[PDB]
């Protein structure tokens, strides 16, 4: 769910996932998807569509296991679903640490209603 | 100081320092050194006998930089003795994460006054 989703994030870039990533871009946090602005975006914008895949859970509102062991994302169990909803979080964390070298602060807090419309998925 | 060595304990083991570690054995946390009950508290041995070299600043007070890149703990340069201060902290946080398949509970809240004085450093 969004927790573990947010956990995540902290542990793998350092930073307070709602703040630099809650409205960043055309794709990352609130909202659907859009064009995205640069590769934080894309990572969000690869993410949602993960998301699309997921038969029955909730991906804002159903929790899951996974531990940070030896500074690494482990899934747990889990139930099928469940399972790729915490694979799909672990690959936009990953994505978000590996492009910090590019995040721009100008799309922090982005009006997303003006995105130009996402190809689809 | 403490911000920086409690932030650098959570980065590397996922888990809240002041809790896990802020009274655990005989010399994690509050209080100095003494015989070490188990790997966790020798880290925390180590630590402190870090700290005893560094004269010239305070290890509980003065901040220093570093940063958590690609997921290590990297010291920024600040001067001599706050750069030794970040090295001493950083090894007791990677000490602490690789010593967790021990981690006891039991000692969670030890109380200190009845340890066996420790050896010299
Ligand atoms: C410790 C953080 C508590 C939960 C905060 C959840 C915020 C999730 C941010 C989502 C942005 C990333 C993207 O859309 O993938
Ligand atoms: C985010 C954490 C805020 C600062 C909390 C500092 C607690 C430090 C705990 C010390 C225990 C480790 C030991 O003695 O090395």
Not at 78 to 105: F, H, M, Q, S, W
Request: hydrophobic fraction near 20%.
């Amino acid at each position: 769910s969004l927790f573990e989703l947010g956990k995540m994030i902290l542990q793998e870039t350092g930073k307070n996932p709602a703040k630099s990533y809650g409205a960043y871009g055309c794709n990352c946090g609130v909202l659907g998807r859009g064009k995205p602005k640069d590769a934080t975006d894309r990572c969000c914008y690869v993410h949602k569509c993960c998301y699309k895949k997921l038969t029955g859970c909730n991906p804002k509102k159903d929790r899951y296991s996974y531990s940070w062991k030896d500074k690494t994302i482990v899934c747990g169990e889990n139930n099928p679903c469940l399972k790729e909803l915490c694979e799909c979080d672990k690959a936009v964390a990953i994505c978000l640490r590996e492009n910090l070298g590019t995040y721009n602060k100008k799309y922090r807090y982005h009006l997303k209603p003006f995105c130009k419309k996402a190809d689809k998925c």
